[PDB]
C-alpha cells in the first residue's frame, strides 16, 4: 500500500488548492478513501471522505468549500479546496478506509502534503554555514516562507549525528539550524555539505562547510 | 460530535518495561451493528501514523504481540509490553463508528534513560552573513536527558531575550536522547557593537551551568 499525497503549498485567504493523492498497491476502485489533515497543535481532523460508488460526505466546518473526487483509472484521489481560510493551513494526508466488507476505519496514510494559507509571500531561505574526538557543524536556514524545507548532509550520506530542528516564526519568515557531528579527522579532511531544498521558492542550496579565518 | 480524550497526555518508561494508556469515549462506541470501531495509531516523530489496533483489540499485522488493546463502550486501554525505544512517539486512539470521525489528543510515551550531559556548541554569526547586514548567533544543546533544560544569552555579561529564538527536537530512538538548537539574532550594526557573546545552559547533570562563548574582537 503506497499512499502520495501532491501539490501542497501556500494560498492567500480566499484561494483555491487541488491536492492529489497517487494510490498503488492495492485495488484502489474498492475502497473508500479520506482526508485528514493534522494542524500544527498537531492534532488530526477529518476533512472528507468519498465513497467506491462515488457517495461524498463532509464535517460542516467544510461544507461547501471542499470537494473530494477520485480518478480510478489514474489511480488517484483529489481534494480540491475553495474559499481557504487561515485556520485551514495543516499537513494533508489521504487516508484509506481498507477494512473492505466492514465499516469505516483508516488503514494506511500517505507521506502527507504541506498547504499554508497566508497573506505572507513565499520568500526563499539564506543558508549560512557553521563551523568552528567530535567535531560538530552546522547550517542556519532563515528567513524563508513557507514551510517545508529539506535538509541533508553529504547528499544525504551523513544520517546518524544529524540534528535538523524544528523552524521557528518570528513575523512571516521562517528560521532552522541543523547540527551534524563527526569524528574530529573527519573534517576538515573530507567535506562536509548541507543542502537544503525550498520547494516553495523553488529554491536548492548547497553549502560547504569550510573553516573559518 | 464525539470528544475523544486520552490519558496520560505524558508516559516515560524504562525499556522491558509496560506501558499503559487510556482512551475514553463521550460516547458508547459501539455500532448499531455491533462492532466497536475504536483503534490506536502511532505517529513517530517526522513520520505519519501507523495503524496499531483496530476495533479494540485486533493488531494491524504490521506490530507484535507487545502491542495489545481492550476496553468496551466507553473506556478503552493500549499497552504496550517489553517497550523499545522504537516504541516512543505520539499514540492516538480514534473513533468510526461515528461521523465525524475523530481523534483524540494522543498521548507521548517518552523512555527512560541515564541522564546524560548536552555537548553545547556556539557559532559566530557566518562570514556571508554578516555581508547581509545580519547576524545570528547559533548555539547547540545536542543529546541530553532528561528533557528539561535552560538557555540563557548574554551579550558582554548581560542577558538577552529580543531576537532568541528556540527549538527543540523529539526523543531520538537511537540512543533516547533530546536535542535543542538557539538562535540570538541582530542587526550586523549591534553585532559589531559587542566583544563577548555567550550562550548558558542549566541542565540536571551538572551544578554549575555549562556555558559556552566566544568573542568578537
Ligand atoms: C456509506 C458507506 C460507504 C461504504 C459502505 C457504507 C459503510 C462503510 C463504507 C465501506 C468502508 C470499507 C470499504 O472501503 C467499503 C467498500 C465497504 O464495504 O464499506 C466502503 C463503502 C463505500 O465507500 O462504498
Known amino acids: 500500500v503506497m499512499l502520495v499525497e501532491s501539490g501542497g503549498g501556500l494560498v492567500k485567504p480566499g484561494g483555491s488548492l487541488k491536492l492529489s493523492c497517487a494510490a498503488s498497491?492495492?485495488?484502489?476502485?474498492?475502497?473508500?478513501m479520506s482526508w485528514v489533515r493534522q494542524t500544527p497543535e498537531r492534532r488530526l481532523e477529518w476533512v472528507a471522505t468519498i465513497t467506491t460508488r462515488g457517495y461524498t460526505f463532509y464535517p460542516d466546518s467544510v461544507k461547501g468549500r471542499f470537494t473530494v473526487s477520485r480518478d480510478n483509472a489514474r489511480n488517484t484521489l483529489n481534494l480540491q479546496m475553495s474559499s481557504l481560510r487561515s485556520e485551514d493551513t495543516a499537513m494533508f494526508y489521504c487516508?484509506?478506509?481498507?477494512?473492505?466488507?466492514?465499516?469505516?476505519?483508516?488503514?494506511?496514510w500517505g507521506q502527507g502534503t504541506s498547504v499554508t494559507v497566508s497573506s505572507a509571500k513565499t520568500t526563499p531561505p539564506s543558508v549560512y554555514p557553521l563551523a568552528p574526538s567530535m567535531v560538530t557543524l552546522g547550517c542556519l536556514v532563515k528567513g524563508y516562507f513557507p514551510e517545508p524545507v529539506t535538509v541533508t548532509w553529504n547528499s544525504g550520506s551523513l544520517s546518524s549525528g544529524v540534528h535538523t530542528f524544528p523552524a521557528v516564526l518570528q513575523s512571516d519568515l521562517y528560521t532552522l539550524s541543523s547540527s551534524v557531528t563527526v569524528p574530529s579527522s573527519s573534517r576538515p579532511s573530507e567535506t562536509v555539505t548541507c543542502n537544503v531544498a525550498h520547494p516553495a521558492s523553488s529554491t536548492k542550496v548547497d553549502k560547504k562547510i569550510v573553516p573559518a579565518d | 460530535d464525539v470528544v475523544m480524550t486520552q490519558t496520560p497526555l505524558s508516559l516515560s518508561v524504562s525499556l522491558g518495561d509496560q506501558a499503559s494508556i487510556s482512551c475514553r469515549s463521550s460516547?458508547?462506541?459501539?455500532?448499531?451493528?455491533?462492532?466497536?470501531?475504536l483503534h490506536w495509531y502511532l505517529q513517530k516523530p517526522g513520520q505519519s501514523p501507523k495503524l496499531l489496533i483496530y476495533?479494540?483489540?485486533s493488531r494491524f499485522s504490521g506490530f507484535p504481540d507487545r502491542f495489545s488493546g481492550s476496553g468496551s463502550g466507553t473506556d478503552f486501554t493500549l499497552k504496550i509490553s517489553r517497550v523499545e525505544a522504537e516504541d516512543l512517539g505520539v499514540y492516538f486512539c480514534?473513533?468510526?463508528?461515528?461521523?465525524?470521525?475523530?481523534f483524540g489528543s494522543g498521548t507521548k510515551l517518552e523512555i527512560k534513560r541515564a541522564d546524560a550531559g548536552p555537548t553545547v556548541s556556539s557559532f559566530p554569526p557566518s562570514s556571508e552573513q554578516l555581508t547581509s547586514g545580519g547576524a545570528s548567533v547559533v548555539c547547540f544543546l545536542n543529546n541530553f536527558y532528561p528533557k528539561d533544560i535552560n538557555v540563557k544569552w548574554k551579550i558582554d555579561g548581560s542577558e538577552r531575550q529580543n531576537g532568541v529564538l528556540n527549538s527543540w527536537t523529539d526523543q531520538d530512538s537511537k540512543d533516547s536522547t533530546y536535542s535543542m538548537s538557539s538562535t540570538l539574532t541582530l542587526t550586523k550594526d549591534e553585532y559589531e557593537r559587542h566583544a563577548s557573546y555567550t550562550c548558558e545552559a542549566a541542565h540536571k547533570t551538572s551544578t554549575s551551568p555549562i556555558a559556552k562563548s566566544f568573542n568578537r574582537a
Open positions: 498497491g492495492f485495488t484502489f476502485s474498492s475502497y473508500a
Open positions: 460516547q458508547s462506541l459501539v455500532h448499531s451493528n455491533g462492532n466497536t470501531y
Open positions: 487516508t484509506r478506509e481498507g477494512l473492505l466488507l466492514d465499516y469505516f476505519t483508516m488503514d494506511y
Open positions: 476495533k479494540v483489540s
Open positions: 480514534s473513533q468510526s463508528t461515528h461521523v465525524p470521525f475523530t
